[PDB]
Design a protein around this ligand. Structure first.
Ligand SMILES: C[C@H](CCC(=O)NCCS(=O)(=O)O)[C@H]1CC[C@H]2[C@@H]3[C@H](O)C[C@@H]4C[C@H](O)CC[C@]4(C)[C@H]3CC[C@]12C
Ligand SMILES: [Ca+2]
Length: 124
């Protein structure tokens, strides 16, 4: 679920709490998404959006109001190391992994301040 995703991100990137703020990043980091990713970090979010999209397509899965972000799963954090609980059901496991991959992608991408709260109606 969204809040778990936030938590999962702080795990892989400690000094990140202040960035989940009211803000949004690039063309895909936030909700919706349109046009083309503006950089590596934004591409991570686009990839994550496509991942959720694949989840919504699994005929064996149905999420509340078709929003994978509502799906709560179980996961644990070690030393910035994320582990998805094997007890999660198939649908939850897919989401957990999407969130995990994104968290890892985020930790490796550069953060470009000029993309914070980018005017999406203009540049996306
Ligand atoms: C993980 C990211 C932090 C940047 C950063 O500190 N990089 C450091 C890199 S390095 O260590 O210096 O290499 C932040 C940037 C904007 C954040 C996103 C935005 O705040 C929009 C969204 C807010 C929601 O509460 C959670 C998902 C949501 C989609 C956030 C995921 C985390 C992001 C992608
Ligand atoms: Ca659940």
């Amino acid at each position: 679920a969204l809040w778990q995703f936030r938590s999962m991100i702080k795990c892989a990137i400690p000094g990140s709490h202040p960035l989940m703020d009211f803000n949004n990043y690039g063309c895909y980091c936030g909700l919706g998404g349109s046009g083309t990713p503006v950089d590596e970090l934004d591409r991570c979010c686009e990839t994550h959006d496509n991942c959720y999209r694949d989840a919504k397509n699994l005929d064996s899965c149905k999420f509340l109001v078709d929003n994978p972000y509502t799906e709560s799963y179980s996961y644990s954090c070690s030393n910035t190391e994320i582990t998805c609980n094997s007890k999660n059901n198939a649908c939850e496991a897919f989401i957990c992994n999407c969130d995990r991959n994104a968290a890892i992608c985020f930790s490796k991408a550069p953060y470009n301040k000029e993309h914070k709260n980018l005017d999406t109606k203009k540049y996306c």
